[PDB]
């Protein structure tokens, strides 16, 4: 996606309209004092993507994301992100013809999460599929690491590791969408059955009623041609109760419309059957796609962990007796012995394992951006420098936004953004 500018207005510490540009699409680092606003910048980036879990980014509701709740004068908080669509390979499916895409999220004391795409109002869903189509699914992230969560990566359940694996190769964004499609189709079949019930319950007896009214006219027509004597005139006068002189046109129109309705219903059923068959073949295919993705990610994970620490290895394996689709767990080997439990590993070792997994996922399919918050918290200076050098040189590919407090990673960073809490708000400067 290659974001090039970020606009923050009224969001947490950034009360004034701060626009930060010149994003080098190779390596971006953010530095500053404690409480400067680097994690606030990351939180603002997370906000525009459409995060739903409010407890994630240091908040309880939508009101506290504004400068000072609903008070202090600031009433609206807007976050704007602008990417670059020069490369059409890594472009949204529905926005391949629109370069320089922009996404804005605004929150007001009255309103809730107003979304704008390219200046036009869009629903929350629209931005959700927009960001999911480019692997930026923030609800179940594969590129996002918060502050203090680097050591807890190995503590996630096997189901979440499986979801992390599925985030690659497009396996994700498919389970939830099939589930939503099934819910929508089940809801629509209730209405379809309702329409069929009214068609077969009330309309048909009216069809026989109008057919009975049709015969009466055929006779009454002859009676009229003779009239054109007194007893026949009296009979004609008495029969002018259900004659319905315009029965022919009305019954013809009703029959034509009913035939059209039946054809539409039959085509709807055929479309339903085709959709179900397509979904079946699609998930049968994604099963093997997941097999390939798991194998490749496991091999890359092992290689990266072997490279990071010379005398260690790692792998991803299914459960003790369950298959791959049930869940995936991490196994580590030190020296020549495997470790039964991962709880005895060091914090630095856990951080290295998490980084190796993230880099394996990048090597399989690089996400447009990778965001890291205090990634070197439990890593020594040598490991921090090695990680920074490897990110600068070997991995590349994607755009890295790393918040670091140690010189090891931002010494060689291609672009550096330095934050100061100047006067009530936070400001960002180059280098």
């Amino acid at each position: 996606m290659k974001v090039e500018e970020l606009i923050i207005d009224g969001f947490k510490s950034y009360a004034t309209r701060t626009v930060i540009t010149d994003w080098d699409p190779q390596f971006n680092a953010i530095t500053g004092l404690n409480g400067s606003g680097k994690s606030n910048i990351l939180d603002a980036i997370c906000f525009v993507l459409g995060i739903a879990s409010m407890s994630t980014v240091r908040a309880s509701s939508l009101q506290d994301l504004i400068y000072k709740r609903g008070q202090a004068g600031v009433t609206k908080a807007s976050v704007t992100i602008v990417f670059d669509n020069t490369d059409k390979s890594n472009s949204p499916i529905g926005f391949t013809n629109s370069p320089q895409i922009s996404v804005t999220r605004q929150v007001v004391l009255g309103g809730t999460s107003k979304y704008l795409i390219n200046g036009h109002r869009a629903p929350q869903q629209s931005v959700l599929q927009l960001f999911q189509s480019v692997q930026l699914n923030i609800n179940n992230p594969n590129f996002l690491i918060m502050q203090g969560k680097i050591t807890k990566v190995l503590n996630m359940k096997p189901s979440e590791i499986l979801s992390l694996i599925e985030e690659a190769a497009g396996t994700k964004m498919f389970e939830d969408r099939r589930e939503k499609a099934e819910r929508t189709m089940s809801k629509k079949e209730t209405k379809l059955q309702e329409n069929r019930t009214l068609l077969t319950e009330e309309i048909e007896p009216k069809l026989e009623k109008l057919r009975n009214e049709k015969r009466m006219f055929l006779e009454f027509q002859s009676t009229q041609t003779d009239l054109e004597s007194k007893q026949l005139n009296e009979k004609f006068q008495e029969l002018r109760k259900k004659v319905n002189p315009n029965i022919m046109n009305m019954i013809e129109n009703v029959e034509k419309k009913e035939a059209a309705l039946k054809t539409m219903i039959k085509t709807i059923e055929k479309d339903k059957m085709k959709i179900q068959e397509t979904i079946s073949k699609l998930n049968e295919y994604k099963r093997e796609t997941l097999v390939k993705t798991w194998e490749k990610v496991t091999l890359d994970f092992g290689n990266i962990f072997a490279d990071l620490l010379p005398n260690s290895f790692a792998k991803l394996v299914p459960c003790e007796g369950k298959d791959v689709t049930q869940g995936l767990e991490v196994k580590v080997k030190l020296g020549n012995i495997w470790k039964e439990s991962l709880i005895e590993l060091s914090g630095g070792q856990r951080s290295l394992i998490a980084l190796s997994l993230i880099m394996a996922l990048l090597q399989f399919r690089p996400a447009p951006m990778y965001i890291l918050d205090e990634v070197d918290a439990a890593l020594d200076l040598s490991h921090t420098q090695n990680i920074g050098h490897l990110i600068k040189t070997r991995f590349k590919g994607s755009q890295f936004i790393v918040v670091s407090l140690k010189e090891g990673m931002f010494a060689n960073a291609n672009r550096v953004f330095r934050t100061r809490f100047q006067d009530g708000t936070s400001v960002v400067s180059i280098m």
């Binding site: 009229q224 315009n246 046109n249 009305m250 129109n253």
Partner: protein, 477 residues
Amino acid sequence: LSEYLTKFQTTDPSRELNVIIDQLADSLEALIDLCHDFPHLTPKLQTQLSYLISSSLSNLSKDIKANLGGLIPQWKRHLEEYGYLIQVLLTFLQDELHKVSSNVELFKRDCNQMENLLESITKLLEINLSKIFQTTPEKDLFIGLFTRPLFVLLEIEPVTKVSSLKMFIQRILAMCVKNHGQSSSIQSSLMTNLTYFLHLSVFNAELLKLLNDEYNYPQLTEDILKEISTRVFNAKDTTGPKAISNFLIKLSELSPGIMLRQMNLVITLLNNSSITLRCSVVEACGNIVAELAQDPQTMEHYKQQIAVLIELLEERFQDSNPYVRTKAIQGCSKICDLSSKFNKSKAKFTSLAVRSLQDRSSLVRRNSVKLLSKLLLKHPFKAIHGSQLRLSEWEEYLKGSESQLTSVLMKLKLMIVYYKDAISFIKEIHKSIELISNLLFSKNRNEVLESMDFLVLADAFDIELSEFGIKKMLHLV
């Protein structure tokens, strides 16, 4: 004939085409067989065949006009096959015309041959055609053979859009309803089109206006209005109600006087829960009064009807939804924009507006303030004694008139009544200005702009409290 219709509904040509041309200028079956293969036959020969049949039909119409026992059965039979053939032509032309615009050069070609056939059919229909078909069923079937393809063609939206074809169809239907006594069938067809489509309400209204104005035949539109009043709708579609609302609005804007006759029964539609229907009824009443206030003979004839419509207009300000109130406010705005009588109704409008300024609906508030602004701009109290109103000055003039107080008695009584009405109007305007200054701090940008415009107009028409609002406006920075 009947077997031919049953079969048609259930279901190198160039060499024969030249033969048919010479013969006209078992050959009858050959022409039908040639005409039955239009979807496969080349578009080139279709134009020539249509021109030939149009010319032959026009020549036969001219011959019939020149003639009028005689050879009545022969001419009747010949007209019967010609009507069947022109129905086949119309059906085959609307075929693939439904396909196109659902290319454009074929569209123009089809439309052109269509207007040719429309001139041919109008020349056919201009004759009396009454004595040749003694029995009513035969005439009904013959003219249905003409009309049903016309409605099937009107089903297509560009056909309704194109003015030439629309006018030709309207003229055909007007002539039919005027002379062939098929009001019931035409009304039923129009009602089916209205209830099944949304793009034919304007067409129906224009056809009814043409029929009325140029044929002196309001029976069809009165029957249509009665049927619309007596119909009931279901909640799920709302498309029938929307089409009926559009048709009513168009008919009110075009020809209000004729529909005034059946508006007494049309009012019963307001009891329905249809928002569109209620809005259409109130807007139609407003349009009728607005376009009938011009004619003094029309007032002298329909004082009671206009009064009851206006009274319903004031009374409809109270409803759960704001849309009917907004439509009533536009009706009142049109009435007050009219330069005419009913100063009592104008004062009632002023009172209703100042009372409804505090509505929870921003749209209704905006429209009430706009109504009050137009009232200030065209208040009747400006013919004499200037056009500037001031509370202290008017009170001083009233006190002077009271101190000074047959012909002289009535003059003083009228002056006192006028001064009291002016004082009441100025008090209501002062209250409205105060309320609008209070309300100015509102979220709606359009509401703020229109309240500012009202305050500016009130300040221009010098008022003691206007400066108050002016200061409020200064506070809008």
